[PDB]
């Protein structure tokens, strides 16, 4: 009951014709969070990428960084909808109003 595609007669790679596998790759530039760019040899066909979050903006990798901007995936939620739909009620002064319930 296993899903297995039937195997065809394997072609004979006789001795001496064993060519290496050289997969098509592109000299692709990787743009980090900062202006740092590293050239990476990749198969996917497009030359530049931006990394929204990377080692640059990770506290674990930069313990000494006092200022560290943080950005996460933008699919929907706070940064997307909670902000534009609630663009009047403002502040962390306001966070001190709901600071504690003063309950044991």
């Amino acid at each position: 009951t296993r899903i297995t595609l039937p195997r065809r007669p394997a072609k004979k790679i006789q001795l001496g014709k064993s060519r290496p596998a050289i997969y098509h790759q592109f000299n692709v530039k990787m743009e980090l969070s900062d202006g740092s760019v590293v050239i990476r040899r990749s198969q996917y066909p497009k030359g530049e990428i931006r990394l929204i979050q990377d080692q640059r903006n990770n506290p674990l990798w930069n313990p000494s960084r006092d200022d560290l901007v943080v950005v996460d995936a933008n699919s929907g939620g706070s940064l997307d909808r909670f902000n534009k739909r609630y663009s009047s009620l403002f502040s962390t002064v306001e966070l001190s109003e709901e600071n504690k319930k003063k309950t044991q």
Partner: protein
Amino acid sequence: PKIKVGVLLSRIPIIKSELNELEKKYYEYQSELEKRLMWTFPAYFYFKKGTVAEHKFLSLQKGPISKKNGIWFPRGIPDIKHGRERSTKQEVKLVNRPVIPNDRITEADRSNDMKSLERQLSRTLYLLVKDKSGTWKFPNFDLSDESKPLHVHAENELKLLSGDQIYTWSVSATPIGVLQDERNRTAEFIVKSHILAGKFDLVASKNDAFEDFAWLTKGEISEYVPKDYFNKTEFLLADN
């Protein structure tokens, strides 16, 4: 013999090392050889049929010449499989603002500023400091207490010399070498440290030691350090 602690700071390179002329041309030769043996690009997988991006890529590319009966070809009958001639390399032409890499030559390079930590991004900078005289050398700090390890003594004394404006790492408590002098009966121990943030900024106004500093590399260490001092430390530096 009094013990004297010296500290050599190193600024690790921020960018990849530059390549020699032989390295540049040899690599180019190999890359072209690899492109000659390069495989066909499987565009039929990444670019699905009917996708607008797929059809944009097709127009973005230039097709190969196909074999055709009754027409002579000087360079040979075309051999195309999966839409690519098999007798030569294949060229695949590829906010979303374009990636503009930053220049590898900074302002400090053109201005020839010596105090800055960006004068040579791809090299290793060493903090060389001048004495009362014109003799430039690594900072030598004298201790008498002996209640602290030598590498810690250099670290704490360095921070108070820079006004707590530096962040240095102590690689190891093992001194790198000895610079013994017989005239003053002084034994000098060098400790390897790495600068992480901040600058030196000498602020000691008591004139206890040092007047000028620099962030030279090995090539420039040679021209400013005296030959005798240089000879006993040539091996403790990084070429690149």
